[PDB]
Design an enzyme around this catalytic site. Structure first.
Site, PDB file in Angstrom:
ATOM      1  N   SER A  57       0.783  -1.215   0.000  1.00  0.00           N
ATOM      2  CA  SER A  57       0.000   0.000   0.000  1.00  0.00           C
ATOM      3  C   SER A  57       0.817   1.270   0.000  1.00  0.00           C
ATOM      4  O   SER A  57       0.264   2.351  -0.111  1.00  0.00           O
ATOM      5  CB  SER A  57      -1.020   0.039   1.160  1.00  0.00           C
ATOM      6  OG  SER A  57      -2.187  -0.734   0.871  1.00  0.00           O
ATOM      7  N   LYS A  59       0.129   3.876  -2.719  1.00  0.00           N
ATOM      8  CA  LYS A  59      -1.008   4.824  -2.714  1.00  0.00           C
ATOM      9  C   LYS A  59      -0.564   6.270  -2.680  1.00  0.00           C
ATOM     10  O   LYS A  59      -1.266   7.140  -3.197  1.00  0.00           O
ATOM     11  CB  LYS A  59      -1.962   4.442  -1.580  1.00  0.00           C
ATOM     12  CG  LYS A  59      -2.708   3.144  -1.844  1.00  0.00           C
ATOM     13  CD  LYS A  59      -3.386   2.521  -0.667  1.00  0.00           C
ATOM     14  CE  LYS A  59      -4.185   1.319  -1.007  1.00  0.00           C
ATOM     15  NZ  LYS A  59      -4.481   0.398   0.105  1.00  0.00           N
ATOM     16  N   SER A  85      -5.822   3.760   4.151  1.00  0.00           N
ATOM     17  CA  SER A  85      -5.287   2.680   3.300  1.00  0.00           C
ATOM     18  C   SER A  85      -6.439   1.992   2.528  1.00  0.00           C
ATOM     19  O   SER A  85      -6.355   0.813   2.209  1.00  0.00           O
ATOM     20  CB  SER A  85      -4.418   1.639   4.003  1.00  0.00           C
ATOM     21  OG  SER A  85      -3.427   1.165   3.082  1.00  0.00           O
ATOM     22  N   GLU A 128      -5.794  -3.469  -6.370  1.00  0.00           N
ATOM     23  CA  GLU A 128      -6.030  -4.090  -5.087  1.00  0.00           C
ATOM     24  C   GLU A 128      -7.116  -5.123  -5.192  1.00  0.00           C
ATOM     25  O   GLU A 128      -8.139  -4.905  -5.901  1.00  0.00           O
ATOM     26  CB  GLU A 128      -6.487  -3.053  -4.049  1.00  0.00           C
ATOM     27  CG  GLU A 128      -5.419  -2.050  -3.658  1.00  0.00           C
ATOM     28  CD  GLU A 128      -4.349  -2.597  -2.744  1.00  0.00           C
ATOM     29  OE1 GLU A 128      -4.311  -3.784  -2.457  1.00  0.00           O
ATOM     30  OE2 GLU A 128      -3.504  -1.716  -2.313  1.00  0.00           O
ATOM     31  N   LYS A 131       3.383   6.576   4.835  1.00  0.00           N
ATOM     32  CA  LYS A 131       2.398   5.604   4.347  1.00  0.00           C
ATOM     33  C   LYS A 131       2.964   4.219   4.558  1.00  0.00           C
ATOM     34  O   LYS A 131       4.056   3.899   4.039  1.00  0.00           O
ATOM     35  CB  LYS A 131       2.045   5.818   2.888  1.00  0.00           C
ATOM     36  CG  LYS A 131       1.047   4.838   2.342  1.00  0.00           C
ATOM     37  CD  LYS A 131      -0.379   5.136   2.801  1.00  0.00           C
ATOM     38  CE  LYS A 131      -1.366   4.018   2.544  1.00  0.00           C
ATOM     39  NZ  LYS A 131      -1.317   2.984   3.587  1.00  0.00           N
ATOM     40  N   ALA A 162       0.985  -3.371   3.925  1.00  0.00           N
ATOM     41  CA  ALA A 162       1.025  -4.735   4.338  1.00  0.00           C
ATOM     42  C   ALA A 162       0.418  -5.610   3.235  1.00  0.00           C
ATOM     43  O   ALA A 162      -0.642  -5.237   2.676  1.00  0.00           O
ATOM     44  CB  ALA A 162       0.222  -4.956   5.638  1.00  0.00           C
TER      45      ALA A 162
END
Ligand SMILES: [Cl-]
Ligand SMILES: [Cl-]
Ligand SMILES: [Cl-]
Ligand SMILES: [Cl-]
Ligand SMILES: [Cl-]
Ligand SMILES: [Cl-]
Ligand SMILES: [Mg+2]
Ligand SMILES: [Mg+2]
Ligand SMILES: [Mg+2]
Ligand SMILES: [Mg+2]
Length: 263
Positions: free
Chosen positions: A45, A48, A105, A141, A209, A212
């Site tokens: 992540s 992002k 997230s 995602e 940021k 995981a």
């Protein structure tokens, strides 16, 4: 500092996995410390931030509006979408999606933002155009979190993303308004910050940021420093561990604690 290297090594030993690490001076970009800086690791992540940088670049160019409302459907919702699952009927603005993607997230938010820019290949193209020759986004995602052995998809190196983050947060790649917005999103309070915010002294700045994924993937990118101003970029990544999540988090947190102690 060498003591942080020793803690990186100890994390490798405790986690049974590689750890990549770099520290840059924010103003000059000088490498202050590094371990496996040019090895590849999954973004998870952490990407992002890069995504919202690409969105903001489009806003600066008059190609996107932060207030544009995005309407989506139930089937767009994927796991770990705590904000977007509350806006099926009403939609969310681009601004709201970036806030959710960074601070919460939110996975669906990131997928919607990827649609706004035209997808993973368009993010990768943006990165190439700003001089990042390594980072790649291939999937959306949650697929990008797979962490498959021997898969180059959805990876970066510590060195590459550290430089990219510096480009986004400093200088003129983004307008001042857009830099500041990106910073603001990354600095906003979040529910749990085990990796670096747990180590951070009072009065220090951090814009971060975390990420995981599957198969042990875990990471953080950050700009931080004393006195309410950032002075360094730090990037920490790992993948492959099958230790518990708490142990992963603890080992990375101890790297941060070292960085702060020997600052
Ligand atoms: Cl090394
Ligand atoms: Cl290396
Ligand atoms: Cl769109
Ligand atoms: Cl740099
Ligand atoms: Cl964190
Ligand atoms: Cl666990
Ligand atoms: Mg052990
Ligand atoms: Mg609809
Ligand atoms: Mg090359
Ligand atoms: Mg705060």
């Amino acid at each position: 500092h060498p003591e942080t290297l020793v803690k990186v090594k100890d994390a490798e030993d405790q986690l049974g996995a590689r750890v990549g690490y770099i520290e840059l001076d924010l103003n000059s970009g000088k490498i202050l410390e590094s371990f496996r800086p040019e090895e590849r690791f999954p973004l998870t992540s952490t990407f992002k931030v890069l995504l919202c940088g690409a969105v903001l670049s489009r806003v600066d160019a008059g190609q996107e509006q932060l207030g544009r409302r995005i309407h989506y459907s139930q089937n767009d919702l994927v796991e770990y979408s705590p904000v977007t699952e509350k806006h099926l009927t009403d939609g969310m603005t681009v601004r709201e999606l970036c806030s959710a993607a960074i601070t919460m997230s939110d996975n669906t938010a990131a997928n919607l933002l990827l649609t706004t820019i035209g997808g993973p290949k368009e993010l990768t193209d943006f990165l190439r155009q700003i001089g990042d020759k390594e980072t790649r986004l291939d999937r959306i995602e949650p697929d990008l979190n797979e962490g498959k052995l021997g898969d180059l998809r959805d990876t970066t190196t510590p060195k590459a993303i550290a430089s990219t983050l510096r480009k986004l947060l400093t200088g003129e790649l983004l307008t001042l308004a857009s830099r500041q917005q990106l910073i603001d999103w990354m600095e906003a309070d979040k529910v749990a910050g085990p990796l670096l915010r747990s180590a951070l002294p009072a009065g220090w700045f951090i814009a971060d940021k975390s990420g995981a994924g599957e198969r042990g993937s875990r990471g953080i990118i950050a700009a931080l420093g004393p006195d309410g101003k950032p002075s360094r970029i730090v990037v920490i990544y790992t993948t492959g561990s099958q230790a518990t999540m708490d142990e992963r988090n603890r080992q990375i947190a101890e790297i941060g604690a070292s960085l702060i102690k020997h600052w």
